[PDB]
């Protein structure tokens, strides 16, 4: 009776002809949510059946197809009716807390193979609504802390994020999680040490205090010493630490030195601090082999990225003493020697053909990805240093030429066999903030003090197509997962502001400079920059309709209701399609036409 109602409602909402005839009927959804309101008084007889309907709707209609309209939209709408039944029933009925809350948790903890995002959404809602009403039904939480070791890692990250508003207000629940995380820090399974690392990074990220406030500082220092020990484990726990240390700084500034030395000593295992020694990172120590099983430990690319981000935040925020200049000149020596290194210092392309048969080709492939990541980090660094110096842009070009040489190496080796590996399309190490700033500086910027220095970058067309490729990759990551890979890529407001800025830049490059300026070559007619800007526009508009649905007004204001703004944008795009059509081109790029009608189909859903 609930699924039928949602099918009926979808059928009427999709068609005006049925809206004219049928007068607006109350649906079973609105009736059920009226029952839950009505039951406040004395109807306790009803409410134990409300709870069972809630969990039957969620259990029966939750996702599985990601681990279409008819299998999706009247099942998405029933499963979100379930959570609405249980969340409204939880709020007013003060006795079926611990019957929802120990059954939500019992489905989150124990299932962990079937998708359980809906229960983590519901548990986030339940907690966030009132941890003041959950400190009377709290022990149902701290009995699922004891099961935290055996869960997969994403469930542990998601469950800790969800239950975080309970950890803000309650000190007993925080000191009950600390005993579990400290106990599982040493446990013999692999995932238990990852879950301990995740939980300690989140307790350092979101909290200052963990009684005199000298011991809180030494507790932070002891946690940070345990995480410094975890820095000598396997590759993924190291990688989790490298993403986390930036946000540890950016909240608790006081741990500055205790993070930065922790990276700098870790940098000095893989750095050679003498000039005129041409492979300026020891790439051998990053790969361990034990009887033909061959694997990575200490990714240099993410280490350098974390160092450079923390160093930029150290310059811009902390200073407005004689430590950061050491790491500056270390990074500058890495740039200066990575410019005049070439490819036999890491024995690439000549001695090993990166074969996925032998261990040596594995080693050289890992080496190649490491050098690519290092060059991307140093591109971002050299941009970040100065106010548009020519010399640093020459170094940016030289580093990008090294990266592009390694990419053209790796692309030909995916030319004998297939491109079945998704490891060259693996993430860039440029933040979305940097790609936004780089494209604003490349296209729009016409300040005469920066023109002579940007003109060496504009003259490199392959650099500009790499830049828009990276921007398209960040929008694709925002669509596919919830959020993007870099720093500040888990805060929705920061991805929103960077989405607005990319939209503005790609619109200015699309509308102002036409398509018919193609003076490169006939291989670049499906790969032109004015095509890629329209493609990134399409991805941005789709992603902003999906994720940032409540903000579309303040999405369009950055480019009066949503109708006039959307109408002006449609006027731009449909003028573009009109001049594309009435030009009467015999070659006729139909790709640009398909993208224009796709972006118009995206836009016309707002009117």
């Amino acid at each position: 009776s609930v699924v039928k109602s949602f099918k009926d409602l979808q059928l009427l909402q999709g068609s005006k002809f049925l809206q004219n005839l049928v007068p607006h009927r109350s649906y079973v959804s609105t009736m059920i949510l009226e029952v839950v309101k009505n039951s406040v008084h004395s109807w306790d007889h009803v409410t134990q059946g409300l709870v069972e309907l809630g969990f039957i709707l969620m259990d029966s209609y939750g996702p599985k197809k990601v681990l279409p309209s008819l299998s999706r939209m009247p099942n998405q709408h029933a499963c979100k009716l379930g959570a609405n039944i249980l969340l409204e029933t939880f709020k007013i009925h003060e006795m079926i807390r611990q019957e929802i809350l120990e059954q939500v948790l019992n489905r989150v903890v124990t299932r962990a193979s079937s998708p359980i995002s809906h229960f983590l959404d519901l548990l986030s809602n339940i907690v966030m609504y009132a941890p003041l009403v959950l400190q009377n039904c709290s022990s149902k939480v701290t009995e699922a802390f004891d099961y935290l070791s055996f869960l997969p890692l994403q469930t542990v990250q998601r469950l800790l994020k969800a239950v975080q508003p309970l950890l803000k207000v309650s000190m007993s629940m925080r000191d009950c999680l600390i005993l579990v995380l400290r106990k599982a820090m040493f446990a013999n399974q692999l995932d238990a040490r990852k879950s301990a690392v995740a939980g300690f990074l989140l307790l350092l990220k979101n909290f200052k205090v963990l009684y005199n406030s000298v011991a809180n500082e030494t507790f932070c220092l002891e946690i940070m010493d345990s995480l410094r020990r975890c820095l000598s484990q396997q590759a993924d726990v190291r990688l989790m630490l490298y993403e986390g240390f930036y946000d540890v700084l950016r909240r608790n500034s006081q741990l500055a030195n205790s993070v930065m030395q922790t990276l700098l000593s870790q940098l000095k295992q893989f750095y050679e601090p003498e000039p005129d020694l041409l492979p300026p990172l020891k790439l051998e120590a990053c790969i361990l082999t034990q009887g033909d099983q061959i694997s990575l430990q200490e990714p240099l690319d993410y280490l350098l990225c974390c160092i450079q981000h923390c160093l930029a935040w150290y310059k811009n925020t902390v200073i407005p003493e004689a430590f950061y200049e050491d790491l500056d000149d270390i990074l500058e020596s890495i740039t200066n020697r990575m410019i005049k290194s070439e490819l036999e210092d890491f024995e690439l392309d000549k001695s090993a053909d990166f074969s996925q048969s032998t261990s040596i080709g594995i080693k050289n492939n890992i080496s190649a990805f490491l050098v690519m990541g290092v060059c991307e980090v140093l591109i971002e660094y050299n941009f970040s240093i100065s106010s548009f110096s020519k010399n640093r842009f020459e170094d940016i070009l030289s580093l990008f030429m090294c990266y592009k040489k390694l990419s053209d190496i790796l692309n030909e080796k995916a030319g004998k066999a297939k491109t079945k590996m998704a490891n060259k399309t693996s993430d860039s190490l440029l933040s979305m903030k940097f790609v936004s700033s780089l494209l604003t500086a490349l296209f729009r910027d016409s300040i005469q003090s920066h023109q002579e220095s940007l003109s060496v970058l504009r003259s490199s067309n392959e650099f500009m197509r790499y830049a828009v490729n990276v921007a398209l990759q960040k929008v694709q990551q925002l669509k596919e997962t919830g959020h993007v890979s870099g720093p500040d890529g888990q805060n929705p407001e920061k991805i929103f502001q960077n989405l607005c800025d990319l939209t503005r830049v790609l619109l200015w490059r699309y509308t102002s400079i036409p398509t018919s300026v193609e003076e490169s070559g006939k291989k670049e007619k499906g790969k032109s920059i004015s095509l890629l800007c329209l493609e990134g526009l399409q991805k941005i508009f789709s992603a902003v309709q999906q994720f940032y649905q409540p903000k579309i007004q303040q999405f369009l204001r950055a480019l009066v209701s949503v109708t006039q703004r959307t109408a002006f944008q449609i006027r731009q795009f449909q003028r573009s399609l009109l001049n594309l059509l009435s030009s009467q081109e015999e070659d006729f790029n139909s790709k640009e036409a398909l993208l224009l009608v796709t972006v118009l189909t995206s836009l016309s859903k707002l009117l």
């Binding site: 120990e102 019992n106 903890v109 124990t110 009995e143 699922a144 004891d146 099961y147 106990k183 040493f186 446990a187 013999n188 000298v214 500082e217 030494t218 220092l221 002891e222 010493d225 345990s226 410094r228 020990r229 006081q254 030195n257 205790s258 030395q261 003493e321 430590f323």
Partner: protein
């Protein structure tokens, strides 16, 4: 005027007289490498260490001076570690400060929370956690074994749980053996030792032996520690051993030895069993098999019916099955009205 305080002043730490924290002029690594090269390039090399640590122990005879030496320093340039941890960061100083840290720990057995409510021997063992380098690992192990023997009960409960922080990743075998040999004698310390034994790196056939050892003496445990031990036993089941341990637990648990003194502990224990079978389904089927297969023994306890009602009231696929089993206990006379 002592060699210790002069070397610490020229190294760059202001020694406070014993109220507030010690100040720092330079960074931590700067001070450590500075005192390292100071003791290196100084003449009379194999005696300045002994002169230094004799000056150190003569300085930490005082309560306030030693209490501030344990506590963490102050940054002038915004808060860092302690002088003892920084001083133990240097490998050539390490074993002397280890020895003169453990020799004065029996001084603080009966001393407990006088003025600032800072308990001293937990602060003494706090400085050994997460050492970057350990020289004397076997000697440190034997020193904490002598300490873990001679200690008060609260203090040995306290130091026993900070064991995996203190030790590295080598010496866990003899520690496991000595802890199990302490476990077979002392039953007051059952609760932390098992806590630590999974948290070290032992071989699994040691853990199954210790699990059998603690299930054997399950009747001789005080009331406050019983839900914690049963929590460990239920948390430490696999898929393969589960019915044997569950049957042992069914045969050993009575509630005619523990009956606001016992009713609260029984409440907590049934919370532990309820929550264990809730978040893990095979313990319910294991426990029904452990009751149903008890056919010959007409010594059925209270625990059999309370567990049949609890597996009924929780996970609700079992209902018909516990409806069936309970019918076959009543016709057969095995469960009766008394």
């Amino acid at each position: 005027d002592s060699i210790f305080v002069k070397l610490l002043k020229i190294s760059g730490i202001i020694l406070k007289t014993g109220e507030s924290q010690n100040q720092l002029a330079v960074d931590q690594i700067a001070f450590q490498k500075k005192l390292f090269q100071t003791l290196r390039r100084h003449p009379s090399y194999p005696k300045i260490i002994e002169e230094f640590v004799s000056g150190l122990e003569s300085y930490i005879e005082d309560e306030d001076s030693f209490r501030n030496c344990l506590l963490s320093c102050e940054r002038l340039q915004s808060y860092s570690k302690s002088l003892i941890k920084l001083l133990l960061g240097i490998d050539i100083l390490q074993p002397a400060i280890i020895k003169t840290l453990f020799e004065k720990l029996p001084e603080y057995f009966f001393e407990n929370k006088n003025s600032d409510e800072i308990n001293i021997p937990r602060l003494i063992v706090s400085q050994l956690k997460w050492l970057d380098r350990v020289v004397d690992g076997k000697d440190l192990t034997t020193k904490i074994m002598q300490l873990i023997s001679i200690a008060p009960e609260n203090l040995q409960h306290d130091i026993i749980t900070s064991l995996p922080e203190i030790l590295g990743d080598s010496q866990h075998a003899d520690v496991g053996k000595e802890l199990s040999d302490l476990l077979i004698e002392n039953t007051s310390l059952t609760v932390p030792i098992l806590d630590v034994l999974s948290s070290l790196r032992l071989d699994p056939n040691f853990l199954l032996k210790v699990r059998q050892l603690v299930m054997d003496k399950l009747s001789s445990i005080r009331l406050e520690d019983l839900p914690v031990i049963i929590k460990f036993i239920l948390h430490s089941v696999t898929a393969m051993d589960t019915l044997e341990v569950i049957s042992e637990l069914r045969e050993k648990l009575d509630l005619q030895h523990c009956v606001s003194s016992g009713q609260s502990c029984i409440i907590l224990l049934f919370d532990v069993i309820k929550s264990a079978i809730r978040y893990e389904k095979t313990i319910s089927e294991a426990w029904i098999k452990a009751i149903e297969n008890t056919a010959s023994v007409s010594e059925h306890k209270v625990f059999d019916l309370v567990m049949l009602f609890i597996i009924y009231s929780t996970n609700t696929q079992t209902k018909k099955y516990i409806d069936r089993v309970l019918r076959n206990k009543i016709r057969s006379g095995c469960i009766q009205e008394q």
